[PDB]
Design an enzyme around this catalytic site. Structure first.
Site, PDB file in Angstrom:
ATOM      1  N   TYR C  67       0.879  -1.171   0.000  1.00 44.37           N
ATOM      2  CA  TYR C  67       0.000   0.000   0.000  1.00 44.37           C
ATOM      3  C   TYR C  67       0.918   1.222   0.000  1.00 44.37           C
ATOM      4  O   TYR C  67       1.837   1.309   0.812  1.00 44.37           O
ATOM      5  CB  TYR C  67      -0.867   0.032   1.263  1.00 44.37           C
ATOM      6  CG  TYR C  67      -2.347   0.013   0.990  1.00 44.37           C
ATOM      7  CD1 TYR C  67      -2.993   1.122   0.445  1.00 44.37           C
ATOM      8  CD2 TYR C  67      -3.096  -1.144   1.207  1.00 44.37           C
ATOM      9  CE1 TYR C  67      -4.359   1.074   0.108  1.00 44.37           C
ATOM     10  CE2 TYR C  67      -4.455  -1.205   0.876  1.00 44.37           C
ATOM     11  CZ  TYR C  67      -5.077  -0.095   0.324  1.00 44.37           C
ATOM     12  OH  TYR C  67      -6.400  -0.172  -0.035  1.00 44.37           O
ATOM     13  N   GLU C  69      -0.488   4.699  -0.841  1.00 43.17           N
ATOM     14  CA  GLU C  69      -1.428   5.753  -1.198  1.00 43.17           C
ATOM     15  C   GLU C  69      -0.983   7.119  -1.713  1.00 43.17           C
ATOM     16  O   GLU C  69      -1.629   7.662  -2.612  1.00 43.17           O
ATOM     17  CB  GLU C  69      -2.441   5.928  -0.075  1.00 43.17           C
ATOM     18  CG  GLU C  69      -3.405   4.755  -0.047  1.00 43.17           C
ATOM     19  CD  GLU C  69      -4.579   4.951   0.884  1.00 43.17           C
ATOM     20  OE1 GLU C  69      -4.350   5.103   2.111  1.00 43.17           O
ATOM     21  OE2 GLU C  69      -5.732   4.945   0.383  1.00 43.17           O
ATOM     22  N   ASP C 222      -6.603  12.032 -26.226  1.00 43.36           N
ATOM     23  CA  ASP C 222      -6.785  10.708 -25.652  1.00 43.36           C
ATOM     24  C   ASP C 222      -6.204   9.725 -26.683  1.00 43.36           C
ATOM     25  O   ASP C 222      -6.951   9.104 -27.447  1.00 43.36           O
ATOM     26  CB  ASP C 222      -8.271  10.421 -25.438  1.00 43.36           C
ATOM     27  CG  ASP C 222      -8.513   9.136 -24.670  1.00 43.36           C
ATOM     28  OD1 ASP C 222      -7.639   8.241 -24.689  1.00 43.36           O
ATOM     29  OD2 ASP C 222      -9.590   9.017 -24.054  1.00 43.36           O
ATOM     30  N   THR C 248      -4.205   4.647 -22.472  1.00 44.52           N
ATOM     31  CA  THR C 248      -4.254   3.332 -21.862  1.00 44.52           C
ATOM     32  C   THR C 248      -2.875   2.771 -22.180  1.00 44.52           C
ATOM     33  O   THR C 248      -2.208   3.239 -23.107  1.00 44.52           O
ATOM     34  CB  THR C 248      -5.300   2.434 -22.511  1.00 44.52           C
ATOM     35  OG1 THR C 248      -5.128   2.452 -23.932  1.00 44.52           O
ATOM     36  CG2 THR C 248      -6.676   2.892 -22.155  1.00 44.52           C
ATOM     37  N   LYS C 251      -3.566  -2.121 -25.691  1.00 48.54           N
ATOM     38  CA  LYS C 251      -3.818  -1.741 -27.082  1.00 48.54           C
ATOM     39  C   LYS C 251      -2.449  -1.595 -27.762  1.00 48.54           C
ATOM     40  O   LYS C 251      -1.509  -2.267 -27.350  1.00 48.54           O
ATOM     41  CB  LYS C 251      -4.627  -0.443 -27.144  1.00 48.54           C
ATOM     42  CG  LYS C 251      -6.016  -0.571 -26.532  1.00 48.54           C
ATOM     43  CD  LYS C 251      -6.766   0.749 -26.507  1.00 48.54           C
ATOM     44  CE  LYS C 251      -8.044   0.647 -25.667  1.00 48.54           C
ATOM     45  NZ  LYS C 251      -8.880   1.875 -25.855  1.00 48.54           N
ATOM     46  N   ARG C 257      -3.112  -3.711 -18.516  1.00 52.88           N
ATOM     47  CA  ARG C 257      -4.166  -2.716 -18.369  1.00 52.88           C
ATOM     48  C   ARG C 257      -3.925  -1.625 -17.330  1.00 52.88           C
ATOM     49  O   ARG C 257      -3.777  -1.896 -16.145  1.00 52.88           O
ATOM     50  CB  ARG C 257      -5.480  -3.422 -18.094  1.00 52.88           C
ATOM     51  CG  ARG C 257      -6.070  -3.945 -19.345  1.00 52.88           C
ATOM     52  CD  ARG C 257      -6.806  -5.222 -19.111  1.00 52.88           C
ATOM     53  NE  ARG C 257      -7.374  -5.687 -20.366  1.00 52.88           N
ATOM     54  CZ  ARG C 257      -8.331  -5.039 -21.014  1.00 52.88           C
ATOM     55  NH1 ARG C 257      -8.829  -3.904 -20.515  1.00 52.88           N
ATOM     56  NH2 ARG C 257      -8.779  -5.520 -22.163  1.00 52.88           N
TER      57      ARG C 257
HETATM   58  C1  LIG Z   1      -9.944   2.100 -24.857  1.00 53.57           C
HETATM   59  N1  LIG Z   1     -11.216   1.469 -25.305  1.00 53.57           N
HETATM   60  C2  LIG Z   1     -11.275   1.204 -26.808  1.00 53.57           C
HETATM   61  C3  LIG Z   1     -12.380   0.098 -27.234  1.00 53.57           C
HETATM   62  O1  LIG Z   1     -12.317  -0.519 -28.333  1.00 53.57           O
HETATM   63  O2  LIG Z   1     -13.317  -0.177 -26.505  1.00 53.57           O
HETATM   64  C4  LIG Z   1     -10.105   3.651 -24.711  1.00 53.57           C
HETATM   65  C5  LIG Z   1     -10.186   4.256 -23.341  1.00 53.57           C
HETATM   66  C6  LIG Z   1     -10.134   3.486 -21.981  1.00 53.57           C
HETATM   67  O3  LIG Z   1     -10.716   2.169 -21.745  1.00 53.57           O
HETATM   68  P1  LIG Z   1     -10.474   1.335 -20.590  1.00 53.57           P
HETATM   69  O4  LIG Z   1     -11.253   0.159 -20.821  1.00 53.57           O
HETATM   70  O5  LIG Z   1      -9.248   0.918 -20.072  1.00 53.57           O
HETATM   71  O6  LIG Z   1     -11.066   2.123 -19.445  1.00 53.57           O
HETATM   72  C7  LIG Z   1     -10.327   5.706 -23.232  1.00 53.57           C
HETATM   73  N2  LIG Z   1     -10.366   6.504 -24.374  1.00 53.57           N
HETATM   74  C8  LIG Z   1     -10.298   6.064 -25.710  1.00 53.57           C
HETATM   75  C9  LIG Z   1     -10.353   7.055 -26.830  1.00 53.57           C
HETATM   76  C10 LIG Z   1     -10.150   4.598 -25.958  1.00 53.57           C
HETATM   77  O7  LIG Z   1     -10.073   4.025 -27.185  1.00 53.57           O
HETATM   78  C1  LIG Z   2      -9.059   0.483   1.958  1.00 56.66           C
HETATM   79  N1  LIG Z   2      -8.182   1.599   2.392  1.00 56.66           N
HETATM   80  C2  LIG Z   2      -7.671   1.459   3.819  1.00 56.66           C
HETATM   81  C3  LIG Z   2      -6.220   2.141   4.032  1.00 56.66           C
HETATM   82  O1  LIG Z   2      -5.972   2.873   5.024  1.00 56.66           O
HETATM   83  O2  LIG Z   2      -5.314   1.960   3.242  1.00 56.66           O
HETATM   84  C4  LIG Z   2     -10.547   0.931   1.974  1.00 56.66           C
HETATM   85  C5  LIG Z   2     -11.247   1.220   0.698  1.00 56.66           C
HETATM   86  C6  LIG Z   2     -10.652   1.120  -0.720  1.00 56.66           C
HETATM   87  O3  LIG Z   2      -9.247   1.293  -1.014  1.00 56.66           O
HETATM   88  P1  LIG Z   2      -8.605   0.960  -2.249  1.00 56.66           P
HETATM   89  O4  LIG Z   2      -7.226   1.319  -2.038  1.00 56.66           O
HETATM   90  O5  LIG Z   2      -8.598  -0.258  -2.929  1.00 56.66           O
HETATM   91  O6  LIG Z   2      -9.271   1.892  -3.250  1.00 56.66           O
HETATM   92  C7  LIG Z   2     -12.639   1.629   0.743  1.00 56.66           C
HETATM   93  N2  LIG Z   2     -13.305   1.745   1.957  1.00 56.66           N
HETATM   94  C8  LIG Z   2     -12.772   1.506   3.224  1.00 56.66           C
HETATM   95  C9  LIG Z   2     -13.635   1.680   4.425  1.00 56.66           C
HETATM   96  C10 LIG Z   2     -11.329   1.077   3.305  1.00 56.66           C
HETATM   97  O7  LIG Z   2     -10.642   0.801   4.449  1.00 56.66           O
END
Ligand SMILES: *[C@H](NCC(=O)O)c1c(COP(=O)(O)O)cnc(C)c1O
Ligand SMILES: *[C@H](NCC(=O)O)c1c(COP(=O)(O)O)cnc(C)c1O
Ligand SMILES: Nc1nc(=O)c2c([nH]1)N=C[C@H](CNc1ccc(C(=O)N[C@@H](CCC(=O)O)C(=O)O)cc1)N2CO
Ligand SMILES: Cc1ncc(COP(=O)(O)O)c(CNCC(=O)O)c1O
Ligand SMILES: Cc1ncc(COP(=O)(O)O)c(CNCC(=O)O)c1O
Lengths: 478, 478, 478, 478
Positions: C67, C69, C222, C248, C251, C257
């Site tokens: 972790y 953050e 983008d 991203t 691709k 990812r």
């Molecule tokens: C990627 N998605 C292209 C498709 O064929 O669906 C993408 C993204 C982010 O996608 P993600 O799935 O990781 O969240 C954002 N913006 C653009 C223009 C494209 O092409």
């Molecule tokens: C986990 N974060 C606790 C910390 O102090 O690090 C968490 C989350 C989501 O965290 P994420 O890092 O995956 O996004 C959401 N809600 C609660 C109550 C806690 O504890």
């Protein structure tokens, strides 16, 4: 042939100079029927009053014809040389009337009315979705102080802004400043409102101010109901602790319908060791929100009326009127308590009082309608509870209206009795049909019937006779 | 004996019945100085007019004293029996004046003014952040139809709602309905506004309606500038295609300052699916947005004034007045074109015209100030081909004001010449100064700073002499 | 403390070190079944690709356990000494891979994926209800660029922000930059998006930039679909005109990812003659939007994967791969055009192409399903002016996937024929029922009943045999 | 392409199959350095843990290569036959692990992580500017449960929504459910959050539920920190009273980083006199919020990992692990109390505890840094009361991490002493420094002072020796 459309152009000519009495007999009739009503009747509505002839006489002036959209600074039109005189004179008299140093205060006399003045300030200082804290509606606060409920958003204020109310201890009827300070820390208001429509006690502007600065918010006072009492000096002025003060010019101020926005300027805050300074930008933000932000062209004729009332407010005859107003309230609250009715918080510090009819099985909804049938106009104001408007539990009574007609203590006691007689009647008629029917039916044995209407008919008379014996400010009966 | 106190109560007594002439000589002076101004001067401000005596006489009535927060039927205070008569009468006359079937239309006569009426509708039908499309401000559209720039949102409208304007072809000055239809598909307006403050041609309500329904949006007409021409029948009525129509009651309607909201009611959408109906809910939403939503207590005295003007609007003397109004416009537009000035879109279909001073090196800002110095109330206006705002390139002229004073074609031609003389003067005084001269500097040399004030002084005189020879609606002698 | 510290603790012990092959045979089975599918099949999905073994190998590392953050500046945790090494190395390689001067650019490698990166930027630079302009979805844009309707606001972008799209000339398939410049002046975007998911031509960043500065808005690119082509230098880089570039890492970049946000820094503009220099505050706003704004703790294992892929992207082996990728596209677009199909805008400038099956009575919906049944990967994208979706008239094909497996021109031609055979089949199965039959009627009657799944079975085989003859990057059989 | 380029194609070929060990030695080095760190060190960070080899092994699978944007039975791509198997299997195991009747519950396994899952729900059920109530950050709440200063809104939650927190009695450290019920009536939350990041006691879901229904709001539980304890049955399940339950899959669940959203479904309505049957609509809103609303394409490889961990969570070896986890906490809390330290609320009901170092002149900020220098992963955390905020007063300790490595009571006591020794050291290095603290100064001296780094060096050693004697889950030496 007499030079074209001769005939009609002659008519159109007269039509524009012909008196209302001839031009429109129907509207003329209604106005006189209404003038009459006000004469032979007891107006106990806290927010009403009778405007002087001087004021009214200015409302129908030529000023109603001029457009002057900007400010005495820069207008968007010409020929505002006189409108400018008028506007500045009113602004001048406004600061005077409230003993305000023009170095630290400024005003805006363009708000069409009370509600508009408020929305204008939230728009200028709070901004969309900004947080606002006001006194809950059924606790004494006003619609425009952010009023919503578990299900619906009633006020424009709670719609365009994020509002949350504070309350009064149901036990004593006083504002719970402790809970407010508590919640303000969790909600982070951006502006706090110190003003009421139905609170008979003075506000702790001092403490409210503390809470406001604690969360770094603005403290705005809406002294609509006490604008007059304040100008007259009979009650504590909010101008000592608030950053902004809005108000209606009718009511305890006895002017025509309009609103004003008073705001601080310059000398804002001082830093201890950090010796750096901060200023007020209120003037700039507020004046702009009013125009072109929210309003069109100012209603110069109303402003003229206000200027007239402002002058009258500075007189001794005024200071004495306002004093009698307060005195009369006590009289009525005493005679009423004496008669055995419950007056919230015990009594009043201002011009109004709130009756808790609950300790009589009757609610404010029924009682209000009966008293109306007897020429006694008032409010079925909501009590410090959770029921709801249109069928409350208390009645709100005020004295400015009647005091302006002469009435003194002795007379207000006679009034108290008339009222007692009225509720007395309500209780009776309640049982003479004892069931589970609501107000809508109550209108029956009341409107229709006759035997029950013979009682009201009697009381209504004794009341109208008592009323008609007093003066009624205004024009030559109109 | 009891002097000490009752001595004052005598004053306070008179103060409330004493005439404005005595009570406040200062305010009284200003009002007369202003009444005078309007008499000896040529009012060419498109949005101004002179209200009949009948109307004004109602403004200063006792009605200014009554509180009636609700609507006829269910008010929040009592004693509204007469205010109810009045309110219903006015609503009745409103639907009549515009030949509206009370089965399909309804009105709200409580808006304090024009801008308020509009915001009330957006509040009721659009809701926070809802999309609205109006005519861009510099293209003839009005402030409240949405006005914002690259960095700051101005009109409260663009602040609480999401607005985007449509335009006029700069080449011809006509509304580009084709672009509007195009953009509406990409923006998805929730409401489209068909109304102007500076457009001399009729609106294609028919086409606008099509576009509205195409995107399933409401079509709202803001007929403020043509309320009178419409009531009189001299121009095409928006009531044939719009769902909602808002308006001011002053201007071409010659009443006191206020606004109204007309809305459709009944069934909409046959639903060629099954025997199933679809109704209009406008009445419900709008009435609630007006109150308790946005406003406080109605200004019954203004409503009275409106009712009076509505009656007058239904007369033949009115229908003829409005006809002369139109005629006078052509006359002025012709004489002016003849004199060699450019009139946008060529001429006018209504009561106003817009001059493009650009083809003369002078702008509307300078010219406006000169004509003012000569008792000719103008009003500069932004326009096609660059917008300086407050420092435009055109002048907006209207005829309702002067037509109401008698002026006919021959007279409006004499007016045209006066104006020509004025701009003539402006061109002169310009040439004679630094090519890097500010408007404030122009305003200097115009001041008593010249032999140029000898020129204006001459023209001002010939104008004031010409003016003072006509009638001036209003109150005979205060 | 019996069969516990003996049995259960020995098991629990092994369970945490036991291989997936044993621990979960079910999940293990599925993964191999899927690994297989990818091997014996033609992946023509423009947005897919096969990640190197190096990258994948880092995804399942110990990093998945830490972790961290905050940021390399200051975190909120301890023991980030190594996570800090990793994060900074990745940020370093990111700026290198795109030849960016660390003096003018900065990056954020914490976005969980593409969509998140975008929302992060809008959140940082646009703010709630702020205006955004993107390429309409069916015109070639991606949901994250905002996508709504006259009925509902669908994407998160059009929900929390105010969006309006621009289009492509349906006639030629190219972005209509003229209309965009036009509308931007009326809408006042706060940010404009230059990026696509289905556009085979390069973007005029130069002109877009002009339009953006004209309305004083940010230009955000983008480059998700061309991240790789850009890093490799085979296509024009958006970094020359955009203020911000999101992407991203999968691709065309062939990583795991995730997403990244590139932003400008240091000296935004110097005043004309005033030394005062406006600066870029993007770094500050964006970094905060990611955390503590929208995300929790970074996924350090994914970041590791990215760093690995970034390194690989800077190789010559990469630059050549990307070159073949482009080449292969032409080959496929030519062979396809040659076969008589319509390719929007004529051809491609990048790695993908869009077929307009419309000129064959068949839609992309049907065709896509058939080709799937034959081990051929698609995308039934919409087409310029498609008279609505539900019946998209096109197919989206890409070459990165297969190029990464070896395929060259000759092979892509053989691919083209396989595809031809497929649509060929679609028409057939379509030609006999060829009526208002829904895609579901086809969906069924197709693979559903008629025993000519014998046709598909044949083609599927010839395809799978052709496929299985190529390499498949990745882990040693997972 | 001839012999010119074709050489490299051999390299590019290997590069995609070459092991990380060779491909990127730099990144490889860092990963091992980090794997090492975790081995020879005491991880006491409440939110950390070590994932099984089984889980990790799935993270780097081929699944990282597939795009499957939609949902099972409604995708926008093809070849999802296996991804569909995987997704449904995980959804199945999710409901099993928590003994949920698939008739009343449903899940979404696509949230990239914890924060995302939450925002997704607010987006689906609360909507822009909707009101939300959560546990104040410093009282034990999480960043995404809303957080905003009076000057600005930090968490995305308080930015796009309107939030207001509830608190814990500073006197006892327990959540003040009475104040919450009170404020909820005044604020009207639309959703209430029952979840913490630093609260050692169970939540009164029962009471919270009452309050929620009282104001007609949704009760959402964020069981991130206790997902494992709950699945194992060792602590009270929130699924008995909440409408929605979100969670991370790492932490007390020992899976890979991701999140899930559990929601109620089917009925829960019927009221009047006629069996209503309004049903739940959560499934619909939430699933859409996640997609096409906020996310792009699911990370199938992470979902695979989750499915693996879910299976493991249902074992007895798991149920016992979780039991030891709880037991170990008591042990550490007792030994620590015994040593004379203050443990908020007295002790713990779960896997973590909060120390109030305040009763020792030292704050959590200093103490945390020292313990780090000694291979002890701690964590400062403000506790109920201190205005401090920047001067913490507390340390948050958890046992899941170390329990997973074998550690039992006896060992956790030895740990307690190590910690004692650490704070001991802090006081020393601190009990000889000016007075006007400044951690900027503490951390300074900490490093350079021989005596001091010789002390730490000793303790660090005894710690690392103690540590290295335990097992460390995960792939072999990775
Ligand atoms: C990627 N998605 C292209 C498709 O064929 O669906 C993408 C993204 C982010 O996608 P993600 O799935 O990781 O969240 C954002 N913006 C653009 C223009 C494209 O092409
Ligand atoms: C986990 N974060 C606790 C910390 O102090 O690090 C968490 C989350 C989501 O965290 P994420 O890092 O995956 O996004 C959401 N809600 C609660 C109550 C806690 O504890
Ligand atoms: N065509 C027209 N449209 C109108 O709405 C308008 C007009 N005529 N006739 C006169 C008045 C007043 N016009 C106004 C025009 C602009 C601003 C305005 O936006 N002022 C700016 C100044 C700064 C700038 O230009 O950027 C401001 O910020 O306050 C206010 C009033 N009026 C009918 O109402
Ligand atoms: C179309 C239109 N709508 C609303 C208004 C509102 O104005 P009031 O607030 O004054 O009531 C105006 C005013 N137009 C004034 C002018 O062009 O000069 C208008 O022209
Ligand atoms: C404190 C306060 N402020 C502003 C207003 C504004 O009202 P108008 O819009 O009517 O002008 C009122 C109305 N008070 C009216 C009553 O209680 O009867 C008020 O009580």
């Amino acid at each position: 042939m007499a030079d074209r459309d001769a005939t009609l152009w002659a008519s159109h000519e007269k039509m524009l100079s012909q008196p209302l009495k001839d031009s429109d007999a129907e509207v003329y009739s209604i106005i006189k029927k209404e003038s009459n009503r006000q004469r032979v009747g007891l107006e106990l509505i806290a927010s009403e009053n009778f405007a002087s002839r001087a004021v009214l006489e200015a409302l129908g002036s030529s000023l109603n014809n001029k457009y002057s959209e900007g400010y005495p600074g820069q207008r968007y039109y010409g020929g505002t040389e006189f409108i400018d005189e008028l506007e500045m004179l009113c602004q001048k008299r406004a600061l005077q009337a409230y003993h305000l140093d023009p170095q630290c205060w400024g005003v805006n006399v363009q708000p069409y009315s009370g509600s508009p003045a408020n929305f204008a300030v939230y728009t200028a200082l709070v901004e969309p979705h900004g947080r606002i804290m006001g006194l809950d509606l059924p606790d004494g606060g006003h619609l425009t102080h952010g009023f919503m409920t578990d299900k619906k958003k009633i006020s424009a204020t709670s719609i365009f802004f994020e509002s949350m109310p504070y309350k009064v201890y149901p036990e004593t009827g006083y504002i719970n400043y402790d809970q407010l300070e508590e919640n303000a820390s969790l909600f982070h208001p951006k502006l706090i409102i110190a003003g009421t429509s139905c609170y008979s006690r003075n506000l702790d502007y001092a403490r409210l101010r503390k809470i406001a600065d604690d969360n770094g918010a603005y403290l705005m006072a809406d002294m609509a109901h006490i604008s007059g009492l304040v100008a007259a000096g009979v009650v504590p002025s909010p101008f000592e602790h608030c950053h902004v003060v809005t108000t209606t010019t009718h009511k305890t101020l006895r002017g025509c319908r309009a609103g004003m926005i008073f705001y601080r300027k310059g000398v804002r805050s001082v830093d201890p060791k950090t010796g750096k300074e901060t200023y007020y930008e209120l003037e700039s933000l507020i004046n702009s929100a009013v125009f072109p932000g929210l309003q069109g062209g100012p209603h110069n004729h109303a402003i003229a009326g206000v200027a007239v009332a402002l002058k009258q407010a500075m007189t001794t005859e005024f200071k004495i009127y306002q004093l009698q107003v307060l005195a009369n309230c006590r009289a009525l609250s005493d005679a009423l308590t004496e008669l055995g009715y419950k007056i919230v918080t015990g009594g009043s510090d201002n011009h109004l009082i709130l009756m808790d009819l609950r300790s009589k099985g009757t609610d404010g909804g029924r009682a209000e309608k009966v008293l109306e049938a007897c020429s006694i106009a008032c409010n079925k104001n909501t009590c410090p509870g959770d029921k709801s408007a249109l069928r409350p539990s208390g009645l709100r009574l005020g004295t400015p209206a009647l005091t302006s007609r002469g009435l003194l203590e002795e007379d207000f006691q006679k009034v108290a009795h008339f009222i007692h007689r009225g509720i007395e009647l309500t209780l009776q008629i309640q049982s003479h049909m004892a069931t589970k029917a609501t107000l809508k039916e109550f209108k029956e044995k009341l409107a229709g019937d006759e035997k029950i209407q013979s009682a009201v008919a009697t009381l209504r008379e004794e009341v109208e006779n008592f009323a008609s014996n007093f003066s009624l400010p205004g024009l030559p009966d109109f």
